[PDB]
């Protein structure tokens, strides 16, 4: 029965399971390098690192494959947009992304269940 | 995933002869050596367009149709 | 039409009006308007090409 | 009046589906083999 | 919790790399393009997103919701004249998509540009769209004022959509705004125009109800 | 006035530069307007069938 | 007292829902006659333009107009985001899925094949009989 | 009634040729009415006798379905293309392949010969058309600019020398010299799968499942709109007497007046005995050089041959 | 050393395994039930 | 532009069959269809081919008759290709011609 439940649950193969673990390990080593770099910037030690790749640094530096918006019949050279408020004392990685679909739905499912069982 | 269909093909115009001869490579196949470097043309007896222009095709077609039907009749 | 021809030239022919959607008339018979241009002009364009 | 499996005639005849005026031509293997050519050279 | 703009730019690097990789993978269906443009507009970096929508229109210019999202980004971020250019290019390249015309005549009315919406409606009646388009332009007029110009629109609409139901609706209009003599002139023009052998009952039914 | 001589090319000289480098396909020419008919009307029943 | 009924039929088109949504927004709006008569008296001859008059590249809307447009468009985005209402999740039904996507695919199977596969489910619930 | 249409005598089937083992996807007539080629999905090309309807030769060599076949008028050659990705020249002196035209990234759907230059043009599924020199087997130009598979192509000697419709619902009129689009005609709503050229009047027709359209040549003006044959049409062919033939995927075939745009006959032919009701379909149709026989390559692995009915007017609208 | 009498537990695992794997994969179902082969699972089903 | 030589033949055939079906369903749907639902019809065609090979009678209870007829058409076409390839390789194996071992196993499995 235990093997029956454990095999009725599974849908993933070898490569999906190694990629999920690789994603968790990449997240862990990213938080570790983040802590090391945060300490080096907090005390203040300007050790620079390397980069060995052709593409990839072209994303933050500039607009990647930029197409200019086609212009005509209306002057649009004067108007501009206002940048985002930084606010780096409340802002979190979850805040930029927005709430998760599973998280919100999960929450409601909770509420739903609660009300049903209470009634 | 890995095993997946296509739903769009690979487009042409970005390799070996497509825009600037792929910037003039010095690589060439053995199938790209000179071969049949002379176009053969239709001669006067074959079906040259001088001979095809004046021909009434309907009479000759009807005659060949009649001969084929007569052959099929005389066989059985 | 000028907002339609951004990167095109001035002699490019594009269709953007509703008068381009209405059918023309029957164009009755052997009219010298709808004719393949000229056999010597055909030979000239053939030689150029 | 039993019909064996060896006959079992489905799919009625080409003369029955197209009629008498249409002449039906069933062509398996061909006249003039691949050595005997189409448009002939000037000999 | 993110500190100063180094770690913020690292997060932006990871997200833009993920989106550009998804674009490189598929290059088709615009959910990747729209999601990447929404993520770029959510961080108020809308020039990146202008580039994203222009690239996505280079991929597929006949996809109407892509135009709708790009123009509603430029309306949402207070860039009126950009969005105005976008709607003009939209109604130029897709003249049969009525969505663009309804939203652009709605934007010009919400911005207070009356005559701009009049000119867009006249460009729209150049294409001879449908019943609902002419009714929306009549409703635009009657919402403001101008029973005479709306009557001219009705004249054009009965000349370019000959149908007994449209003459009945214009008759009901001339009833409801108390121009019974003008309505009678419309009646005497309609019953002569339709002829003798074609008509269905409804014209003479509504005209008998009027004279009742 | 400038006298131009074409440089004399070495026969025993291999290709000079890398050519295998590849960049993605650029933007196509400006989109053409569609000139379609007015959207024949779709019904709920046929949409379900 | 007035009374108006407007239910929805089936989907059938992306343009019919647009038209319904446009009739809703265009009945909700209210015109200001003061700004209208002001711009009319300022513009004069060209206030009733043709397709080709001159004013295409002239209008500059003030802050109140663009604020009204932005607030209206935010309300329209909210009304669009409320389109697919989540149906309440009961856990008393015998679940026949092991994933999160399997439940919705079984729901689609019950949508499409649910009219035809009505005897076999009865056979299952009565004990694989009949 | 603004026009008065010319009376054309109705057509009738008189010969059903059979012997392919796959969908007959192409057909073409020799310049001398002695024989005609078909190409089919049984990976062969069959020379048939045009008078007797007898199989004259069978030529193997393709790896996949044969999609287009054409006989050259200036040279004694037989050009063929396939889903193989292979474009071939068959020397009919030897009945062997002498030249293969390499460079299509995917399946090749049609091909046409330029009538005066010795230049082959081909359609492919990789959204391109290619321009080949016959003598040097090399790609002169790659006509790119369609976004979906390219279905049909034609050639003139006069202006725009290459006209091609495709599955992106557009039609591009090109420049053979430059290699760039001159006119993009977007009027169709569904995929253009057949373009055809009129022999005299310097107009052309184009077909898609919504409707069929007639068009002036220099810049593509709208002239007319021939409607009523609403199925997926695969081929169009023009008679010099102004008879237009539209054959569809559902086997239905309509006969049309070129000038007035009038439908004078509808032909719904029947399938072969073993065949299935869902298998009625026309992939190709061609007139002979006498323009008095109509050869249709069907989806029931048949060649059906039609000729005019010799009985006088029982017709005229 | 395969087979014998069928219990309710093996039959319910067999039902759930047909619900997961289908009626054309019997060696994936019989890997879920020891002391029962694929022919036995197929026969017990039908 | 790689050539379909000998080990790409079945993969190229089944690559082109899918494309022909895609073009036909893009032309066959009427004007107000959401232009989704291509993948499902392709799965119905693959399942119809499996049910042809298994000699299982294939019927989907609700399905539009143009889609059902088109799937039957292309399944008959793939049946013809499969069967003619089997006849050809069986004649080759009978005469003693140069054949692969994999084509012997595939041909036994088809026969
Ligand atoms: Mg495994």
Interchain contact A2–E (C-beta under 8 A): no
Minimal Cα–Cα distance from A117 to chain E, Å? 37
Contact across the interface for E129 and F34, Cβ inside 8 Å: no
Q: A13 C-alpha to center of ligand 1: Å?
A: 6
Spatial separation of the C-alpha atoms in residues B12 and H125, rounded to whole Å: 10
What is the SS3 assignment for E50? helix
Cross-chain Cβ contact F41/G11 below 8 Å: no
Exposed, middle or buried, H149 (CB in 10 Å: 0-12/13-18/19+)? buried
Angle (CA) J61-J64-J68 rounded to 5° is 80
For residue E138, the tally of other CB atoms under 10 A from its CB is 20
* CA separation for the pair H304, G20 (Å, rounded): 53
Q: Nearest CA to G31 among E176, E145, E119?
A: E145
Residues listed for chain H: 317
Q: Which two tokens stand for residue E131?
A: 């019943």
Q: Which residues, in sequence order, are bridge partners of residue H263?
A: H256
- Please give the Cα distance from H146 to H128 (Å, whole number): 7
Cα separation, B15 vs H105, whole angstroms = 10
Range 36-95 of E in CB contact (< 8 A) with A: 42-48, 50-51, 54-55, 58, 77-82, 84-86, 88-89
Contact H215, H185 (CB under 8 A): yes
* CB neighbour class for E118 (10 Å; exposed up to 12, middle 13-18, buried from 19): buried
Nearest to H186 among F28, F29, F32 (CB): F32
Cβ atoms of H300 and H21 within 8 Å: the answer is no
Dist. CA H8–CA H27, nearest whole Å: 24
With a CB cutoff of 8 Å and minimum separation 6, the contacts of G80 are none
How far, in Å, CA of J99 to CA of J91, rounded?
11
Cα separation, A34 vs H236, in Å, equals 67
Please give the full DSSP string across chain A, using - where no structure is assigned. Answer: -HHHHHHHH----HHHHHHHHHHHHHHHHHHHHHHHHHHIIIII---------SSSTTTTSS-TT--PPP--SS--SS---PPPP--TTT--HHHHH---HHHHHHHHHHHHHHHHHH-
**Chain I residues touching A9 at Cβ < 8 A:** none
Contacts 24+ apart (CB under 8 A), E201-206: E202/E164, E202/E165, E202/E168, E203/E164, E203/E167, E203/E168, E206/E168, E206/E171, E206/E172
The CB-based long-range contact list for E169-172 (8 Å cut-off, 24+ gap) reads: E171/E206, E171/E207, E171/E210, E172/E206
If you search the block for the tokens 């690192």, which residue do you land on?
Answer: A49
Cα separation of C6 and E159, whole Å? 36
Buried b (16+ CB within 10 A) or exposed e, C8-42: eeeeeebbbeeeebeeeeeeeeeeeebebeeeeeb
Chain A residues in contact with F24 by the CB 8 A cut-off are 65
Closest CA of chain H from F14, distance in Å? 25
Interface test with I, best of A1, A2, A3, A4 (most I CBs within 10 A): A4
**Kind plus residue range of the DSSP H or E element containing C11:** none
* CB spacing of C18 vs E88 below 8 angstroms: no
- The experimental method is cryo-EM
Residue E52's nearest CA partner among E77, E29, E70, E68 is E70
Q: How many helices (H) and strands (E) does chain B have?
A: 3, 0
Chains G and F touch (3+ CB pairs under 8 A): yes
CB contact at 8 A, E153 and E138: yes
Mutate to test the interface with E, among C14, C15, C21 (most CBs of E within 10 A): C21
Q: CB-based burial of residue E122 (10 Å sphere; 0-12 exposed, 13-18 middle, 19+ buried)? A: middle
Listing DSSP states for J76-93 in one string gives: HHHHHHHHHHHHHHHHHH
Helices (H), B1-76: 21-24, 49-53, 57-75
- Beta strands H96-101 and H87-91 are antiparallel
- Contact status, residue E42 vs residue A81, Cβ threshold 8 Å: no
SS3 G6: coil
C-beta of residue I18 within 8 angstroms of C-beta of residue A10: no
Q: Is the dihedral of CA B17, H185, H67, J39 positive or negative?
A: positive
At residue G80's C-alpha, the angle toward residues E91 and E99, to 5°, is: 15
Using a CB-CB distance cutoff of 8 angstroms, which residues of chain B are in contact with residue D37?
Answer: none
Instruction: Name every residue whose Cβ is closer than 8 Å to that of residue E180 and which is 6 or more positions away in sequence.
Output: E174, E210
Cα–Cα distance between G69 and E71 in angstroms, integer?
13
Q: How many residues does chain F have?
A: 49
Q: What is the DSSP letter of E187?
A: H
Q: Report how many Cβ contacts below 8 Å link chain D to chain H.
A: 78
Contact list in H for residue D31 (CB cut-off 8 A) is 54-56
Give whole-number Cα distances, A23 to A44, A59, A108, B72, in Å.
30, 22, 28, 78
Residue E210 near residue E187, CB atoms below 8 Å = yes
The answer to whether the CB of J9 falls within 8 A of the CB of H83 is no
User: How many other CB atoms sit within 10 Å of the CB of residue J58?
Assistant: 16
Cβ-based neighbours of C15, under 8 Å, separated by 6 or more: F33, F35, H185, H220
Per-position b or e across H39-68, b if 16+ CB within 10 A of its CB? bbbbbbbbbbbbbbbbbbbbbebbbbbbbb
| B8 close to E (CB below 8 A) | yes
Hunting for tokens 């805040």 — which residue is that? A95
Spatial distance between the Cα atoms of C30 and E20, rounded to a whole number of angstroms: 59
DSSP state letter for F10: P
Tell me the Ramachandran region of residue F19: left when phi exceeds 0, alpha when psi lies from -120 to 50, beta otherwise.
alpha
| H or E element at residue H263 | strand H263-268
Residue B11: DSSP 8-state = P
| Set of chain E residues whose Cβ sits within 8 Å of the Cβ of C5 | none
CA J4, CA J14: separation in Å to the nearest integer?
12
Tell me the CA end-to-end span of chain B in Å, nearest whole number.
Answer: 65
DSSP class of H246: E
| Element spanning H106, H or E | none
Question: What does the alpha-carbon distance between residue F32 and residue F28 come to, in Å, rounded to a whole number?
Answer: 11
Q: Does A67 touch chain F (CB under 8 A)?
A: yes
CA distance G22 to G16: 10
Q: Which helix (H) or strand (E) holds H210?
A: none
CA distance H148 to H167: 5
Distance between CA atoms of residues J16 and H84, nearest Å? 10
Q: Environment class of residue E80 by beta-carbon count within 10 Å: exposed (0-12), middle (13-18) or buried (19+)?
A: buried
- Could you give the CA distance from residue J66 to residue H200 in angstroms, rounded to a whole number? 39
In the numeric block, the tokens 């709605």 are attached to E106
Tokens 């959910």 -> residue? E31
Q: Is E64 helix (H, G, I), strand (E, B) or coil?
A: helix
For C:1-49, CB contacts with F below 8 A are 4-8, 14-16, 20-21
Backbone angles phi, psi at A44, to 5 degrees: 110, 90
Tell me the backbone φ, ψ of residue E187, rounded to 5 degrees.
Answer: -65, -50
What is the C-alpha separation between G83 and G74, in angstroms, rounded? Answer: 15
Shortest CA distance to A77 belongs to which of C8, E41, E85? E85
**Is some CB atom of chain B closer than 8 A to the CB atom of J42?**
yes
Chain F residues within 8 A of B22 when measuring between CB atoms: 19
With 0-12 / 13-18 / 19 or more C-beta atoms within 10 angstroms meaning exposed / middle / buried, residue I9 is exposed
Asked whether the beta carbons of H87 and D34 are under 8 A apart, the reply is no
For residue G98, give the nearest of J40, A7, A16 by alpha carbon. Answer: A7
Name the E strands within H125-175: 128-133, 139-144, 150-155, 162-166, 171-174
Reading the block at residue H223, the tokens are: 């002239």
- Measured in Å, residue B3 CA sits from the centre of ligand 1 at 14
C-alpha distances (whole Å) from H143 to each of B18, H127, H218 are 10, 9, 19
Ligand 1 centroid to residue A14 C-alpha, Å: 7
**What's the N-to-C CA distance of chain J in angstroms?**
35
Evaluate whether H78 touches H72 at the Cβ level (below 8 Å).
yes
B8 vs E contacts (CB less than 8 Å): 27-28
Note whether H53 and H312 are within 8 A (CB).
Answer: no
Query: What does the longest C-alpha to C-alpha distance in chain E come to?
Result: 83
Q: What three-state secondary structure class fits H111?
A: strand
In this complex, how many residue pairs, one in chain F and one in chain J, have their CB atoms less than 8 Å apart?
Answer: 15
Residues from chain G that touch E145, judged by Cβ atoms under 8 A, are 36
Query: Residues 6 or more apart from H105 whose CB is under 8 A from it?
Result: B9, B10, B11, B12, H85, H124, H126, H128, J1
Candidates B43, C20, I18; CA nearest to H225 is C20
C18 with E127: Cβ contact below 8 A: yes
């Amino acid at each position: 029965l235990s093997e029956a439940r454990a095999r009725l649950a599974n849908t993933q193969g070898k490569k999906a399971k190694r990629k999920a673990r690789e994603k968790q390990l990449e997240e862990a080593r990213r938080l570790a390098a983040l802590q090391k770099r945060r300490e080096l910037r907090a005390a203040g030690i300007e050790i620079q690192k390397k980069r060995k790749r052709k593409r990839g640094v072209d994303y933050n530096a500039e607009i990647p494959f930029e197409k200019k918006p086609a212009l005509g019949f209306y002057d649009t050279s004067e108007e501009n947009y206002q940048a985002l408020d930084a606010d780096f004392r409340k802002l979190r990685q979850q805040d930029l992304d927005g709430e998760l679909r599973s998280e919100k739905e999960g929450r409601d499912r909770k509420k739903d269940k609660q009300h049903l069982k209470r009634k | 995933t890995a095993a997946r269909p296509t739903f769009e093909p690979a487009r042409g115009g970005r390799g070996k002869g497509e825009g600037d001869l792929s910037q003039l490579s010095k690589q060439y196949s053995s199938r790209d050596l000179p071969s049949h470097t002379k176009i053969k043309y239709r001669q006067t007896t074959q079906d040259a367009p001088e001979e095809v222009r004046n021909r009434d095709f309907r009479r000759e077609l009807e005659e060949r149709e009649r001969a084929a039907a007569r052959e099929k009749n005389r066989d059985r | 039409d000028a907002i339609a021809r951004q990167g095109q030239s001035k002699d490019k022919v594009i269709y953007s009006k509703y008068t381009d959607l209405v059918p023309k008339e029957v164009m009755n018979a052997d009219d010298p308007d709808l004719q393949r241009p000229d056999e010597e002009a055909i030979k000239e364009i053939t030689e150029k090409t | 009046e039993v019909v064996l499996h060896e006959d079992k005639k489905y799919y009625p005849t080409a003369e029955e589906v197209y009629g008498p005026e249409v002449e039906t031509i069933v062509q398996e293997e061909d006249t003039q083999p691949l050595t005997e050519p189409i448009i002939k050279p000037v000999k | 919790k993110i500190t100063d703009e180094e770690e913020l730019n690292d997060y932006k690097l990871r997200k833009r790399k993920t989106f550009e990789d998804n674009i490189r993978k598929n290059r088709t269906v615009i959910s990747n393009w729209i999601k990447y443009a929404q993520w770029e507009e959510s961080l108020k970096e809308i020039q990146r997103a202008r580039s994203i929508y222009e690239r996505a229109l280079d991929v597929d210019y006949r996809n109407i919701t892509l135009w709708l999202k790009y123009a509603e980004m430029e309306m949402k971020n207070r860039q009126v004249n950009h969005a105005r250019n976008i709607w003009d290019r939209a109604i130029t390249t897709l003249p049969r998509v009525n969505q663009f015309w309804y939203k652009y005549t709605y934007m010009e009315e919400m911005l207070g540009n009356v005559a701009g919406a009049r000119q867009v409606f006249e460009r729209w009646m150049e294409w001879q769209p449908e019943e609902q388009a002419w009714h929306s332009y009549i409703n635009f007029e009657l919402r403001y004022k101008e029973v005479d110009r709306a009557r001219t629109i009705y004249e054009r609409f009965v000349l370019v959509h000959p149908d007994v139901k449209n003459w009945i609706k214009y008759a009901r209009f001339e009833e409801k705004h108390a121009y019974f003599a003008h309505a009678r002139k419309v009646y005497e023009r309609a019953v002569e125009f339709f002829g003798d052998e074609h008509m269905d009952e409804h014209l003479y039914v509504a005209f008998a109800k009027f004279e009742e | 006035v400038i006298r131009m001589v074409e440089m004399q090319k070495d026969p025993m000289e291999p290709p000079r530069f890398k050519i295998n480098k590849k960049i993605p396909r650029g933007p196509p020419s400006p989109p053409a307007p569609v000139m379609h008919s007015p959207s024949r009307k779709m019904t709920v029943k046929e949409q379900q069938e | 007292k007035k009374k108006r009924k407007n239910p929805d039929l089936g989907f059938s088109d992306y343009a019919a829902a647009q038209l319904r949504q446009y009739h809703r927004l265009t009945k909700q709006i209210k015109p200001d006659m003061e700004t209208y008569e002001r711009l009319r008296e300022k513009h004069g001859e060209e206030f009733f333009p043709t397709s080709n008059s001159l004013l295409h590249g002239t209008h500059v809307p003030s802050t109140e107009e663009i604020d009204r447009m932005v607030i209206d468009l935010e309300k329209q985005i909210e009304k669009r985001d409320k389109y697919s209402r989540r149906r309440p999740y009961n856990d008393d039904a015998d679940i026949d899925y092991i994933n999160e996507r399997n439940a919705k695919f079984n729901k689609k199977a019950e949508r499409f094949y649910g009219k035809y596969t009505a005897e076999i489910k009865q056979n299952l619930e009565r004990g694989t009989a009949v | 009634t603004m026009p008065k249409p010319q009376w054309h005598p109705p057509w009738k089937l008189y010969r059903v040729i059979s012997g392919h083992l796959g969908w007959v996807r192409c057909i073409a007539v020799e310049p001398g009415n002695q024989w005609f080629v078909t190409g089919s999905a049984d990976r062969t090309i069959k020379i048939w006798d045009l008078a007797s309807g007898k199989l004259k030769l069978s030529l193997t060599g393709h790896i996949s379905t044969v999609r287009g076949v054409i006989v050259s008028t200036r040279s004694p050659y037989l050009f063929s293309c396939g889903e193989d990705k292979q474009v071939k020249c068959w020397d009919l002196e030897y009945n062997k392949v002498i030249r293969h035209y390499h460079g299509h990234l995917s399946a090749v759907y049609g091909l046409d010969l330029h009538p005066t230059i010795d230049v082959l043009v081909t359609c492919s599924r990789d959204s391109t058309a290619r321009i080949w020199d016959v003598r040097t087997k090399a790609s002169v130009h790659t006509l790119s600019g369609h976004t979906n598979a390219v279905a049909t192509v034609r050639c003139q000697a006069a202006e725009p020398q290459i006209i091609t419709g495709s599955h992106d619902t557009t039609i591009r009129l090109w420049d053979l010299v430059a290699g760039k689009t001159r006119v993009t005609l977007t009027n169709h709503k569904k995929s253009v799968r057949a373009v055809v050229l009129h022999p005299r009047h310097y107009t052309f027709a184009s077909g898609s499942p919504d409707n069929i359209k007639q068009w002036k040549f220099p810049d593509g003006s709208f002239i007319q709109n021939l409607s009523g044959h609403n199925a997926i049409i695969n081929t169009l062919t023009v008679n010099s007497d102004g008879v237009l033939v539209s054959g569809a995927d559902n086997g239905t075939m309509h006969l049309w007046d070129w000038r007035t745009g009038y439908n004078f006959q509808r032909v719904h032919a029947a399938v072969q005995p073993g065949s299935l009701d869902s298998e009625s379909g026309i992939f190709a149709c061609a007139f002979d050089q006498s323009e008095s026989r109509l050869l249709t390559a069907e989806a029931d692995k048949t060649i059906k041959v039609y000729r005019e009915d010799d009985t006088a007017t029982e017709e005229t609208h | 050393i395969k087979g014998g009498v069928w219990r309710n537990t093996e039959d319910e695992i067999l039902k759930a395994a047909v619900m997961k794997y289908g009626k054309n994969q019997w060696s994936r179902i019989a890997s879920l039930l020891h002391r029962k082969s694929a022919k036995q699972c197929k026969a017990r089903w039908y | 532009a790689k050539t379909v030589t000998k080990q790409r033949v079945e993969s190229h055939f089944d690559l082109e069959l899918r494309a022909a079906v895609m073009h036909d369903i893009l032309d066959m749907m009427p004007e107000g269809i959401k232009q989704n639902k291509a993948r499902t019809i392709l799965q119905h065609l693959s399942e119809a081919w499996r049910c042809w090979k298994a000699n299982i009678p294939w019927k989907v209870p609700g399905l539009p008759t143009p889609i059902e007829n088109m799937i039957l058409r292309y399944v008959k076409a793939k049946a013809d290709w499969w069967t003619n390839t089997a006849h050809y390789n069986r004649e080759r194996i009978r005469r003693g011609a140069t054949v692969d071992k994999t084509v012997c196993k595939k041909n036994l499995g088809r026969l």
